[PDB]
Amino acid sequence: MNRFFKVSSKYQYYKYLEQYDAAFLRKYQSETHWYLGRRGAWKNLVIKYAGDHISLEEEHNVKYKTHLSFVYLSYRLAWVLFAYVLIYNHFLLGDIGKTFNVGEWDHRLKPSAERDYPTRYESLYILDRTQKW
Amino acid sequence: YELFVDHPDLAQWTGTYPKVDSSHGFPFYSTYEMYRDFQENTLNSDGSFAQWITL
Amino acid sequence: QMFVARQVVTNSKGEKVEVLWNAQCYEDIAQLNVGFAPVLESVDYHWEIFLWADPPIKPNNDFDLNVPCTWFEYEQEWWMESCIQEDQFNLPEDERPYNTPRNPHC
Amino acid sequence: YFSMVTGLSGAALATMIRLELAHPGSPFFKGDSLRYLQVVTAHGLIMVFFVVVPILFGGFANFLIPYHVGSKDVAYPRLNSIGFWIQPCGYILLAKIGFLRPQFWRYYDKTSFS
Amino acid sequence: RMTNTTEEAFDEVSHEWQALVTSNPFDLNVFNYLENTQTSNFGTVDNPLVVFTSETPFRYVGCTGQMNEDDYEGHELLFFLLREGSLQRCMGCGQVFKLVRLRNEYSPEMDYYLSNFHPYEMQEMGESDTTVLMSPYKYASHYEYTQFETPSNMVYSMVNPDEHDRLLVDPAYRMERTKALEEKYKVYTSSLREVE
Amino acid sequence: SDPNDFYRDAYRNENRWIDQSVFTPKTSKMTHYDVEWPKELASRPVTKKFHHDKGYKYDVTTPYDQRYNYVADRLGHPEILGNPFERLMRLEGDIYHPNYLDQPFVKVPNANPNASLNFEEGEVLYENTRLLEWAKFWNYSVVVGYL
Amino acid sequence: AVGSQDILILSVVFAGISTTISFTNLLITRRTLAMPGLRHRRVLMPFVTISIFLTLRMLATITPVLGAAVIMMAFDRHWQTTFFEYAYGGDPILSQHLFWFFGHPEVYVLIIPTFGFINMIVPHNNTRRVASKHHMIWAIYVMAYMGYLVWGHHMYLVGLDHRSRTMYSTITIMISMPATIKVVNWTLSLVNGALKIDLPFLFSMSFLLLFLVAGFTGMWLSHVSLNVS
Amino acid sequence: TVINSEFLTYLKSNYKISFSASNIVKYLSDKSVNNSVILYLRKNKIFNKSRYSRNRQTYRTGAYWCLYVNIIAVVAFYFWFYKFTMNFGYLWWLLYSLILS
Amino acid sequence: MFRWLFLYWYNSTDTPSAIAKVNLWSYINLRLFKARLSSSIAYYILGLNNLELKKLKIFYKNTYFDYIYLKSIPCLFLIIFFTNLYLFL
Amino acid sequence: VAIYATYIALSYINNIWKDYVVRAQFSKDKELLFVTRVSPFGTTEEEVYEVAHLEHLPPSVRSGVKDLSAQDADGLVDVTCMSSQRSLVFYKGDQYWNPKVYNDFINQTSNLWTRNYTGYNRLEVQNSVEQVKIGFSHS
Amino acid sequence: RAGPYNPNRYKDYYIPRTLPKNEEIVEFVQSQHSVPASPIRNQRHINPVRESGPLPSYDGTYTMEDIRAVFYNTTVGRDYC
Ligand SMILES: CCCCCCCCCCCCCCCCCC(=O)OC[C@H](COP(=O)([O-])OCC(O)COP(=O)([O-])OC[C@@H](COC(=O)CCCCCCCCCCCCCCCCC)OC(=O)CCCCCCCCCCCCCCCCC)OC(=O)CCCCCCCCCCCCCCCCC
Ligand SMILES: CCCCCCCCCCCCCCCCCC(=O)OC[C@H](COP(=O)([O-])OCC(O)COP(=O)([O-])OC[C@@H](COC(=O)CCCCCCCCCCCCCCCCC)OC(=O)CCCCCCCCCCCCCCCCC)OC(=O)CCCCCCCCCCCCCCCCC
Ligand SMILES: CCCCCCCCCCCCCCCCCC(=O)OC[C@H](COP(=O)([O-])OCC(O)COP(=O)([O-])OC[C@@H](COC(=O)CCCCCCCCCCCCCCCCC)OC(=O)CCCCCCCCCCCCCCCCC)OC(=O)CCCCCCCCCCCCCCCCC
Ligand SMILES: CCCCCCCCCCCCCCCCCC(=O)OC[C@H](COP(=O)([O-])OCC(O)COP(=O)([O-])OC[C@@H](COC(=O)CCCCCCCCCCCCCCCCC)OC(=O)CCCCCCCCCCCCCCCCC)OC(=O)CCCCCCCCCCCCCCCCC
Ligand SMILES: CCCCCCCCCCCCCCCCCC(=O)OC[C@H](COP(=O)([O-])OCC(O)COP(=O)([O-])OC[C@@H](COC(=O)CCCCCCCCCCCCCCCCC)OC(=O)CCCCCCCCCCCCCCCCC)OC(=O)CCCCCCCCCCCCCCCCC
Ligand code: HEA
Ligand SMILES: CCCCCCCCCCCCCCCCCC(=O)OC[C@H](COP(=O)([O-])OCC[N+](C)(C)C)OC(=O)CCCCCCCCCCCCCCCCC
Ligand SMILES: [Ca+2]
Ligand SMILES: [Cu+2]
Ligand SMILES: [Zn+2]
């Protein structure tokens, strides 16, 4: 056997290697325990506890979660838009002209569409553009 | 019997019954539910009329 | 709704054991009344049919390990036989011929 | 509940169709053949793809299949929830075509003023 | 390919590995494949059909009566709640069911039910280097193949949660316990050889 | 090893009563299992106040001071703290989450290096400075080519 | 013109994808999470579940055809691909073929689950086993997988070849037999049992009464000469 | 390993072996035992009684994704084919509800 | 290493209860590979005193092409003879 | 696509260059090793390692030894940090090494690569393991 | 409210915390293999008996004819008899 010879470190804890064989050290710290050999592995427990809980499910990266501001903005917008869609499609179909605005934008190759303008400013500006090929 | 003992999944797919006998009392270690669609939806079984129409 | 009957039976080892007859449903666990009280009413409503995720079981018996039917086995054909008998006409015994010649070879 | 709402919508469309077909002369649409055709198509599509299908494969299937197969939940609870929450947009799109037209304005609106 | 349990096994994965290696009924019932359950005998008072549960009071059971080769089913399926306690019976056919609530322990009572469970399949364990076979010919008969091999020189030993945390945090304690377990394994092998 | 000869004697109807009787076989007692384990199992602490809906009588927390210390290495792990950039951005990370850091049985490593370590510079062992120039050249070349 | 037609086209594709998600989820649920002992025994499961699974398989089979047809319609409307323009190789009848190939299985999918309700309710109130459950299952299956060759009964007069017309008519009339099998099984399920009259039972009777006339009228429509008018 | 002769004789006297070991470890040689690798299994209380691990019981991101899918479908179809955009100012109090939230 | 289930389950000493004393679970002792029956049909019939196992072996699986060709020679010659008879007919 | 392609390219280039060591300096007590390595833009980045953690490990596959760069007199030496799971790459050329600490460094970071890694002959097979005595202190 | 709970934050005692002795292991193996092991379950019916009572007799106080004469008289009313 090829026992570990000596540990030239002042930290007495590391001297545990002197009590074992080189083959044993390779087997239990190098071959299949390479990612675990001579390591604290506290991150393993921390990540396990992080994953096995009911914490916020909005995820961005493996390291960071989604920004709460972005999440709240998205949720508020979704709820309000869904409510608008339902209400307008179930109650406000009597007067389409009053309930909806007509707008569009066409390819720049074709002449600018009549409905291509900034909504809420049609009474203040007229928009036009030069055609491109 | 060889098919059932060696490749239980293929035996179940083909619809073969468990060919081993457990008269000794210990159930076999690879028993499976019977998939009998092939042998039941046939001219010689309950699907006889459906298979006649399909033929 | 928990058990529809109970009995005490002495097994082959000489010990008396209690056997309870569970309430049953026609293939529909949804129609099955899952309760824990001696009450017919369906009081308990469960959002999670399988609280602990444990799967249910439909055991399949091995033909080798089966036993000849003995739970009123003589009643299996009783329904159809009696349905036929209700409309069958039976000749009176007095009018029915009797003491006819024996078969020569039997 | 969504199926009940969609069935009420389909019943309303059927009522529109029946009122139009009550007697000749278009008592209901008053000559809007295009509007009548749109209403008929909306009724058919809503009833087919958004009443019977949600009732059977949406409510009845989701309620019964776990009971009748012995599963804690569907193999895809997320997909089941998604399928439920996706219906309203299609329902509205196929139901409100009768009301909605590209030419929203009525025949007596002076579009030359705008 | 085989997962390093001392580094990654936790909770559900650790329990699955325990079921695979020890085949203890409590874990084996939990991790038994849904597709196939070992066929049993017909329930009787002397030899009731045993239904296993993993520390749960009741289980939804279904009965179809005496099975025959021609039909494979005795009577139409009837579902009931098999509860822990005394034996229970099916009205239609009289089949007798017994609920065995297995406990997370190693005892002769639990070992008595070893023959009543299929061995846990190993081919689906660990990590697979093939996602799925694109073969219509054997989509329901062949598992994914492996480029690598499966080592068979692995010896498992159960550990408490705090002890496992100690093993993870302290490499010296891990080495000490590993050497002790190796010595005990050597002693066990020598004793078995002497007995033989 | 004749199967019929073995079975005809092993399995008999008249022996059914004793063939299926579970018993604890007579084996030599082991102190670690039959003596030590029951003692430690019975000496478990008991708490009057435990989670009634989900807890048990033995759900006794281990004090932080009694939790095992971290002695694997002296170097600190500032990842636990959460860097000022992440704090300012308000990003939530699992590595520096208080609940996940509060481990039950083992203390997480201290963010600062152990006082024993001295960070005074000594003498240079290895030095290949041209690697910096090579890396700059290769990185700039790949960036230019990709652009 | 542009508007409700394009909205309906895109909504049809949208509903096709929604059905894709739905039947994928349900079929995989059945195939992977079914309880032990019911993995393959379709008979034991209640008739409603069997019908639902069969209809889901039919929807999976037919949805891509409808999706492709609707996509081609959208392309013709917007990009003017002339898939259905006879001038330069387009086939207007191809659109009808592709649509009806899914359309008839669609109505079969709608109807098949309805039979399970009666098939379950009648035994429950009659305290008796259903009549010929295996035969009813095989009849619904034969209807399901033979409805894929009768899509042309909606296109008799379009101008298709007499060979295809005759094939469609023959298979359509042949389809009537399994419906008769189911009707006789329903009728026999009501005899020699302990009846427990209930509102579901009355609804089942009304369903049977309506279905008889519905199927009879469909069979009459199968008459080619009458179908012309 | 080496077992003392006196200890082995004592074991033989106190116990007579009449059954063969079922464990396959008896066939292992010293080389195989040395090459064996020890692995640790974490044993704790068991709460999940299924092969599948515990699954989250809520899908908030999924619900909101479906809401966004519905909104996109309706708005895009109306804008492309009807050219109509909902006038959120008509029901100004829902827009103000968003602004307040 | 067992061939028969009854012999396998008769006297088991490597059960979990026994192995828990040493707390060592070798991978080579898996129940999956612990026992495996032979590929030949075996069925039980009632004997004079108890059930007895009878094996039904029909054909071998190790025949070789030389033997097969030797057995097939007569068929080839008969085919040739019948063809010649047809030609001369 | 542009943003993520640029990010992936830069990050993976940094990861590839991370292994190589630009500078290495012991502490005053020779208890810690300060390592300067390449940064994403080619500048210097500082890190700290423990000499005890530092170790030169043999390859997992024993037939791949001949393929190691260390076989060449001007190759590369792969030193693995067993605590941080990191790799330190050093040129074998003596021009890059301090010739009064190199000997101790290589005699201290090469403890796990021993003779038994190549196998045991029949003279040392018995001594490969420590014999276990059972029952000698009591019956 | 009961409050937050996490069962994994508490110690478990499913396994002994002290390793065995070599001599004790050897003696345990010897004793285990010197005596029969506990039996494993078997699912064979040994002299099976009727689940119900004795088969109804051809003649006697109660015969199978009495049972047969009951199918034709079957009623479940709203009032007692
Ligand atoms: C698209 C544009 C459209 C514009 C429209 C017009 C809008 C104009 C008005 C906007 C304000 C409206 C009034 C409302 C204010 C907020 C309160 C409210 O009611 O609304 C809540 C409203 C909605 O509520 P919610 O989102 O649902 O609530 C949940 C939230 O998550 C909240 O969760 P929380 O409570 O946990 O978080 C609180 C946190 C807000 O949450 C956060 O923590 C978010 C992140 C905050 C910091 C963001 C900037 C710094 C990030 C680091 C990197 C910077 C870039 C790199 C450096 C170089 C520059 C390029 O609040 C703060 O701390 C904000 C105080 C101000 C911080 C300023 C710090 C500057 C540091 C600069 C030095 C460091 C950089 C290095 C420089 C170079 C060195 C060489 O939320 C917000 O608006 C969030 C942000 C609000 C704060 C402002 C953030 C940006 C400030 C940048 C200043 C300029 C910096 C650079 C200067 C140049 C030299 C360096
Ligand atoms: C349904 C009634 C309202 C709720 C229930 C009742 C109230 C309960 C709390 C009461 C006591 C505590 C109050 C403090 C606040 C606690 C909750 C909170 O943080 O606030 C929620 C939330 C803020 O929390 P957050 O920070 O977003 O939550 C993020 C967390 O991660 C948490 O995330 P999360 O997962 O929990 O979900 C976040 C989600 C929370 O989830 C939701 O609640 C989703 C939104 C509700 C369901 C929408 C379904 C779609 C159809 C709705 C149709 C409604 C009817 C038609 C309305 C318009 C036409 C009249 O928040 C949002 O996304 C909010 C979106 C903005 C609101 C849009 C809906 C407005 C109308 C609601 C119905 C009003 C009925 C009464 C008036 C009727 C007039 C005829 O929003 C607000 O605080 C908005 C308040 C102002 C709007 C509502 C009141 C005015 C509505 C306009 C019409 C009436 C005008 C006259 C009003 C006169 C004075 C009242
Ligand atoms: C001012 C109105 C003017 C007239 C028009 C009104 C039109 C209304 C809708 C008409 C159609 C459906 C009518 C159903 C009425 C009966 C509901 C029922 O069975 O009682 C609840 C019932 C509770 O009674 P239970 O189950 O017998 O006993 C349990 C105990 O309650 C104890 O249970 P617990 O321990 O869980 O305690 C909580 C309990 C205690 O609360 C109560 O019992 C209070 C009274 C009931 C309030 C119900 C609505 C509350 C507000 C919901 C807002 C959305 C969620 C945001 C968060 C809200 C937070 C408050 O609350 C609930 O259980 C209610 C949950 C509500 C969930 C709603 C979201 C489900 C997804 C949407 C499905 C339906 C979509 C339909 C539209 C489709 C369009 C294509 O639970 C359910 O069955 C849930 C039904 C959920 C769907 C229906 C209700 C939501 C309708 C939203 C508006 C749709 C408008 C569409 C047309 C117009 C568009 C602009
Ligand atoms: C040509 C088109 C080519 C298209 C190529 C497309 C290429 C890309 C493919 C991509 C998709 C691959 C996946 C396909 C999945 C399909 C859906 C499905 O079921 O998945 C289940 C699958 C898993 O769910 P599951 O519920 O577990 O599945 C259970 C099984 O499916 C089991 O289901 P089951 O329980 O319903 O089993 C029913 C089966 C079970 O019953 C049986 O065992 C059959 C009968 C066997 C015995 C017969 C004996 C008869 C008597 C002897 C012979 C007598 C004749 C004389 C000779 C003998 C004389 C002695 O019986 C039948 O219904 C078969 C009919 C039997 C009649 C036999 C007549 C023979 C006469 C010869 C001529 C006619 C032959 C017709 C074909 C016959 C069947 C192969 O679903 C999923 O995984 C999720 C959905 C995935 C969807 C993926 C996308 C699909 C896209 C499809 C596009 C198709 C386009 C073309 C459509 C139109 C074509 C005309
Ligand atoms: C101080 C400021 C606040 C800062 C704090 C934080 C604020 C958070 C805000 C978050 C906002 C989230 C998004 C909201 C969307 C709202 C949409 C909407 O209703 O717009 C129309 C809405 C009303 O217009 P309307 O005429 O009634 O109706 C619209 C027309 O029908 C048709 O109109 P249109 O044709 O012009 O269409 C436009 C319409 C959409 O209309 C449509 O429906 C047309 C859609 C056409 C789509 C065509 C394509 C089809 C779609 C699919 C295409 C792709 C294909 C998909 C499918 C796949 C195919 C392969 O949407 C918009 O108007 C776009 C949004 C406008 C900009 C709002 C952004 C606000 C700031 C966001 C960032 C804040 C954080 C910065 C950093 C802070 C820290 C330093 O106009 C507004 O935007 C008004 C509300 C503005 C609110 C601003 C934020 C709150 C503060 C307000 C001031 C309060 C006092 C503050 C004092 C502070 C003292 C310290
Ligand atoms: C649930 C929906 C559904 C069902 C189940 C069916 C079932 C059948 N359908 Fe129909 N069909 C439609 C929905 C349905 N159909 C729709 C929506 C259209 C038009 C689509 C469109 O263009 O918009 C259509 C169109 C349609 C046509 C084209 C008509 C035309 O365009 O001119 C034909 C032709 O044969 C037909 C035939 C059949 C047949 C043979 C059945 C068979 O399945 C029926 C078999 C059953 C029987 C035959 C019953 C037997 C009867 C008894 C046992 C009772 C006897 C008692 C007495 C006589 C008193 N259908
Ligand atoms: C032009 C473009 C060409 C295509 C380019 C893209 C290539 C894509 C290649 C990858 C995908 C395809 C790979 C091959 C197929 C793989 C299938 C597979 O594994 O699926 C298993 C999946 C999942 O399998 P599983 O998960 O249940 O089991 C896996 C196997 N074990 C458990 C043992 C590991 O199941 C199925 O879908 C198979 C069963 C259904 C098959 C269809 C049966 C018929 C259904 C309809 C009824 C019959 C109607 C009549 C039919 C005849 C009419 C004439
Ligand atoms: Ca009219
Ligand atoms: Cu049709
Ligand atoms: Zn039964």
TrEMBL record, chain A:
The modification N-formylmethionine is found at residue 1. The chain crosses the membrane at residues 70-91. The keyword Membrane applies. The keyword Transmembrane helix applies. Keywords: Membrane, Transmembrane, Transmembrane helix. This is Transmembrane protein, putative.
From TrEMBL, chain E:
Zn(2+) 2 binds at residue 141. The keyword Ribosomal protein does not apply. GO terms for molecular function: metal ion binding. Keywords: Metal-binding, Zinc. The keyword Zinc applies. GO terms for cellular component: mitochondrial envelope; respiratory chain complex IV. This is Cytochrome C oxidase subunit Vb protein. The lineage of its organism: Eukaryota, Sar, Alveolata, Ciliophora, Intramacronucleata.
UniProtKB/TrEMBL annotation, chain H:
The chain crosses the membrane at residues 62-82, 88-101. It comes from the Eukaryota. This is Ymf67. It comes from Tetrahymena thermophila.
Automatic annotation (TrEMBL), chain J:
The chain crosses the membrane at residues 1-13. This is Transmembrane protein, putative.
